[PDB]
Design a protein around this ligand. Structure first.
Ligand SMILES: [Zn+2]
Ligand SMILES: [Zn+2]
Ligand SMILES: [Zn+2]
Lengths: 39, 113, 55, 176, 167, 101
RNA sequence: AUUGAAAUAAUAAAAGGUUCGAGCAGGUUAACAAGCAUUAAUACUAAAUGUGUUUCAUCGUCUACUUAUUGCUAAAUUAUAAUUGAUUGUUCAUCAAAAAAGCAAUUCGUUAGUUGGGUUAAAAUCGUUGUAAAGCAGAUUUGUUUAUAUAUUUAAUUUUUGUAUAUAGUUAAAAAUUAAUAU
RNA sequence: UUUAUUAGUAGCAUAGUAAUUUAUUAACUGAUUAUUAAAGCGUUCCAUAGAAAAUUUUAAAAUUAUAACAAUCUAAAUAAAUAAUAAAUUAAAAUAAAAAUUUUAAAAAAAAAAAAUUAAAAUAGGGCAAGUCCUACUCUCCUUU
RNA sequence: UAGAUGUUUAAUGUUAAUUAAUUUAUUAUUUUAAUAUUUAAUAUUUGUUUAUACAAAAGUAACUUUUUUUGAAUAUAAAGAAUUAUUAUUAUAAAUAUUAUUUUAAAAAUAUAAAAAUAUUGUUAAUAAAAUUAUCAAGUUUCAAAAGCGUUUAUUAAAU
RNA sequence: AGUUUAAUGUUUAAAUAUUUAACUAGUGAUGGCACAGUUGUUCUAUAUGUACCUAUAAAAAAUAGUAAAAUUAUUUUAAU
RNA sequence: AAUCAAAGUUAUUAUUAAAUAAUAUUGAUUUUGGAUGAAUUUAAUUUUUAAUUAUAUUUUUGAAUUUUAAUUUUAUUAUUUUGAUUUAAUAUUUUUAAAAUAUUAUAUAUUUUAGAUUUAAAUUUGUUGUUUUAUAUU
């Protein structure tokens, strides 16, 4: 009842790297433009 | 007809250099299975090695009896007990080899006469 | 089977290239010049002429 | 299940019982050692073990001799199925002096029907090998005609029957 | 305290005290613990050392009539291991001369007692008197031509026979 | 099977036992064994002696059919007719051999 | 209406629950095992096999065992398994279990409840589903969408100096040994 | 409170993995000592052999590690049964629900193997209702010897 | 449109006084009973090759002409599991018959295991009574608990 | 070599068979005929007495409205 | 790729069933015994193969009930000689067995696409389509 051959929490579906890049939201949030001006 | 297994005809290569099957024909099987195979008429003048064609009729000798003509009659009852379609009744299976088919061959051994 | 199949279920059976290729295909053939009988290629008779030179 | 009293002779193999014992064969060779070794096991078979009690009374002694077998004529005349009040011996006789004759009980006749069907079986086997020692005996005798007529033919036609090579590959007595 | 202390006798044929009580003590060398165990005897006693053939000066022990040489299994050839004394090989009897001489019925369980060159039934030859069997009276149950006697006696290594591994 | 289509035929009848043609009665004369008896050795013992046996139904022969006459089990299989002289002479106990009075 | 008790392997005709979209009483006092509102969901555990969560500084979640198979801890391996949730008809049956018994225990008895040894656990896969495939191809790929992802059983370097009573930090080698493209 | 002999955490009502000792790297094992055992107990106890446990130890079954097709069990051609079957063109998938497990409703999407769902199951498992059954004893009642 | 405020059949349908177009309108979404489908392009089936005993029950789908004896009479091949199926019906006896029913070009499971280095119980509720073998098929030992060897429908300190 | 186990089989070749473990020593027992249903038999398990002992077979209309399954005819004409 | 809505006729053969009717009846489907019988025996004071015109009484208070109808008088146990009469029912087998309309990136049959959706019955004791039954044809 232990020792999985497959360690880690690599999710199943969210793999497109364009609409869900594998970047920790801690390091990805710093690009969310909270002063967005041109559009 | 009994299953879609294919049927190849494996034959040894050149027989015109043989000594036993010199000019035989295989377009059709022997009539009764104890009868020697039809020969190409262009080479009808062929005789065989005796040890081959004297031991054959030694074997073919058992089907020329009536005890096999009883085992033939009988077998047709088995194939009906096991019902196999299209098997004639053992009452109309008149023998393979017979006395009328005896007279030719004893007079076809004119070599030893 | 927890349901019976309407024909439109039985009819989808006849669309895949498995039904078609198994049942509904005509075989390519031609006349064996020696036997004058229909014949497929690569197959021959039990007969000297048909067996020496493949018709 | 076909009560044993129906069989001419009681059956040879006698099946028993014993959910926790699985073996067809009755253990003979144990029923034999007892009986041969212990005299008492089998009931005396009255006569051969009477005739004392009739010697002791009339002679004042133990018989002290081997008792005659084959009970005297006239003994056990009212008995009908003796077979136990005896050994399996026949009912002795009448009280006569006529030559001994087996009273053809249904049992004795059956034994006759064995010793004829024993001679029958040993005769159907004894002459299978007698004709089997013609078929194979004469097949060989004929087969050597074959290797002779093949032996004669294979010299004029020169087929050495030893490969594509000439005898010069043989004379080396190697593989080649 | 595993509870079901009364049991099935589950072992027994899985012991080493068993493996020594299953052997046969036959007439071979086969020191011990090497003889066959389940059937108690090896099939096909090889006898290349001495050919073990039926002799020519052969005769019935019980009847004394000469016996067919070897073309037949009408004779019950009991080779009592190495016998020599009854004949060059062991006692010989036609199948129908295999009865007890004194009581004249069959030799029950086939153990006979050679009384002065006439096989006597063990029970009569022993003094007992019950003198008629049930099944077959005047013909024993025996096998013919040693085929019933090859459960015992003289398997292949009948001696030291070390010629094998020596030079 | 040199058939190219297996069936109740072209099943090579004996692809062994090449030593055919046994003249039993002729050979039985050498052994002096009652020619009628020897030939019985070489067919299932059902067919000759009064023994319990299993027969095929076609072997039994049919009633007179519209297509074929009554084909008795004998006239189609002559050498299978039981010989009850040869049975009795060999297998059954005669009154004679046990006549005691 | 003319006594009181039992499981009898109790049953037959019905619905309706123990294991729950909500309840109850006995774990350091208090947060938690869990005797009543549904409903062929037809026991706990193990094996295998997944999963969406959520949880500090990269960033994070692969331990294997002993005793008992109860389940969850104790505790041994230097150092020791995040927490929730949905999960097991595929696999076992150990437990729990239906006069086969027995022990102590309650019964006037029939019997009842602890404990131990016993005690079938199962059908041709139709739909969905998914893994593959459809015989095809001179060519990976524009966009869909992703079983697929480098580390969590620790060494030896090297800087052990910075800082202070001991001493860090990028890395590298080795180890856990394997590679991945539908028109 | 028969409880003396005797064995006693034992198929011994809980208390428990009994407390000690060993044994194991780790002892809910098992064995030992004694001994107030919820209420064993003289038909007790000892002795005890193939049985079921506990060690030690050795060992071929492919026991973990571990994955490792040699063998036999085609397709096609032929014959043609079975459980089950209200329907389907929806079925997916995500989310809320409201009585329920979720299934619906709604929104919003968008050939062959395996057993996740549909009932992959049979049939066991409950407990309640009315009905009948069967067994039991100081309290009910006949046919009763 | 069409009575009205929603649950008790309309019948001279050949004038049951019939006589060439009555065009019969009346049919129970389940029950059994009979058919037909689905599962089903299927599950089973598949006939290539040969190691002899004889009784009685049991049958009688059963053909007939065949030479039974020296007995009057009497009668001699075939079962049961629903079947031509697992299936030597073991009453006997015997021992060399060249007696004769088994489709086929693949990998998944699975039934199954030839072969093969290490490791030896770490697997598991629990290894060790667990097919055959010519490499000839067998674990040893200690302790504790435990009677008789028979006998049992959930197989034993059952009952003898 | 037919029988306390295990695998396979799971409408299976079987409404118990295949392979296999165990066991196997019956002068005391598959077996002449004999006991029959409120009862036989029981080395006693409420077991069996012809493939569920609740015996079969036979004869009833027992009860079942006290949450079982059903109960056949559209176009209506007073409500709760 | 995908759909597409779809065939009502066998052809040919003749004296049962059911109730009813108030005349017979020693046990239906070979030839007892076949020694000479002892072996081929079903009988007795009870709602029975016997079948009875009232609502008052009386009654364990509650399932219990009415007495000749004309004394041999007809309510009585029954068919051949109208295919025996009548009315209801009607077949059963042999071998028959059939057919040409809706897309082209997908919710469900209407031609002109879009609109459209409890399958019903029960059960709902409004735990209010509560997990029950139905493959279809007659
Ligand atoms: Zn041709
Ligand atoms: Zn002799
Ligand atoms: Zn003697």
């Amino acid at each position: 009842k232990g020792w999985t051959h497959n360690p880690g929490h690599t999710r199943r579906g969210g793999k497109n790297l364009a609409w869900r890049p594998k970047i920790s939201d801690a390091k990805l949030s710093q690009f969310v433009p909270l002063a967005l001006v041109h559009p | 007809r009994s299953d879609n297994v294919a049927m190849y005809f494996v034959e040894y290569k050149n027989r015109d250099m043989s000594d036993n099957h010199k000019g035989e024909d295989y377009t059709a099987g022997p009539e009764r299975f104890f009868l020697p195979p039809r020969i190409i008429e262009t080479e009808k003048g062929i005789q065989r090695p005796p040890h081959m064609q004297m031991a054959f009729d030694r074997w073919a000798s058992k089907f020329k009896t009536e005890e096999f003509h009883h085992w033939w009659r009988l077998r047709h009852a088995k194939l009906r007990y096991w019902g196999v379609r299209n098997v004639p009744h053992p009452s109309d299976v008149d023998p393979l080899w017979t006395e009328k088919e005896e007279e030719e061959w004893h007079n076809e051994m004119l070599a030893n006469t | 089977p927890k349901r019976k199949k309407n024909p439109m279920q039985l009819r989808r059976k006849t669309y895949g290239l498995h039904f078609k290729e198994r049942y509904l295909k005509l075989e390519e053939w031609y006349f064996c010049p020696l036997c004058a009988e229909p014949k497929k290629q690569g197959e021959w008779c039990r007969r000297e002429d048909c067996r020496q030179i493949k018709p | 299940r076909k009560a044993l009293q129906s069989y001419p002779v009681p059956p040879r193999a006698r099946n028993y019982e014993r959910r926790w014992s699985s073996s067809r064969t009755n253990p003979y060779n144990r029923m034999f050692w007892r009986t041969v070794l212990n005299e008492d096991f089998a009931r005396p078979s009255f006569w051969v073990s009477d005739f004392r009690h009739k010697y002791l009374a009339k002679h004042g002694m133990d018989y002290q001799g081997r008792v005659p077998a084959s009970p005297a004529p006239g003994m056990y005349q009212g008995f009908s199925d003796v077979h136990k009040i005896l050994a399996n011996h026949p009912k002795p006789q009448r009280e006569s002096r006529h030559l001994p004759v087996m009273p053809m009980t249904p049992r004795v006749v059956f034994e006759h029907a064995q010793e004829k069907r024993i001679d029958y079986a040993k005769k159907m086997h004894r002459d299978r090998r007698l004709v089997e020692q013609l078929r194979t005996h004469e097949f060989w005798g004929w087969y050597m005609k074959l290797q002779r007529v093949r032996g004669r033919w294979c010299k004029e036609h020169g087929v050495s029957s030893r490969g594509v090579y000439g005898p010069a590959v043989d004379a080396a007595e190697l593989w080649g | 305290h595993g509870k079901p202390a009364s049991g099935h006798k589950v072992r027994t044929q899985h012991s080493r005290r068993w493996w020594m009580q299953s052997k046969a003590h036959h007439l071979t060398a086969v020191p011990h613990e090497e003889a066959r165990s389940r059937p108690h005897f090896p099939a096909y006693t090889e006898d290349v050392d001495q050919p073990m053939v039926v002799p020519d000066g052969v005769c019935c022990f019980n009847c004394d009539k000469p016996i067919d040489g070897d073309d037949i299994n009408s004779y019950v050839w009991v080779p009592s291991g190495n016998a020599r004394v009854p004949t060059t090989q062991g006692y010989f009897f036609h199948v129908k001369c295999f009865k007890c001489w004194n009581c004249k019925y069959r030799i029950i369980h086939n153990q006979f007692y050679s009384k002065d060159s006439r096989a006597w039934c063990l029970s009569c030859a022993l003094g007992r008197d019950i003198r008629v069997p049930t099944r077959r009276w005047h013909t024993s149950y025996v096998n013919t031509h040693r085929t019933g006697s090859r459960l015992t006696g003289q398997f292949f290594p009948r001696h030291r026979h070390q010629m094998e591994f020596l030079f | 099977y040199n058939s190219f289509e297996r069936g109740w035929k072209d099943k090579t009848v004996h692809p062994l036992d090449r030593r055919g043609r046994f003249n039993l009665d002729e050979a039985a004369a050498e052994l002096q064994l009652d020619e009628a008896y020897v030939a019985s050795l070489y067919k299932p013992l059902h067919y000759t002696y009064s023994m319990k046996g299993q027969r095929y139904p076609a072997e039994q022969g049919r009633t007179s059919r519209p297509g074929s006459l009554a084909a008795s089990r004998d006239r189609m299989f002559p050498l299978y007719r039981r010989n009850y002289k040869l049975n009795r002479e060999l297998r059954v106990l005669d009154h004679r051999r046990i006549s005691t009075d």
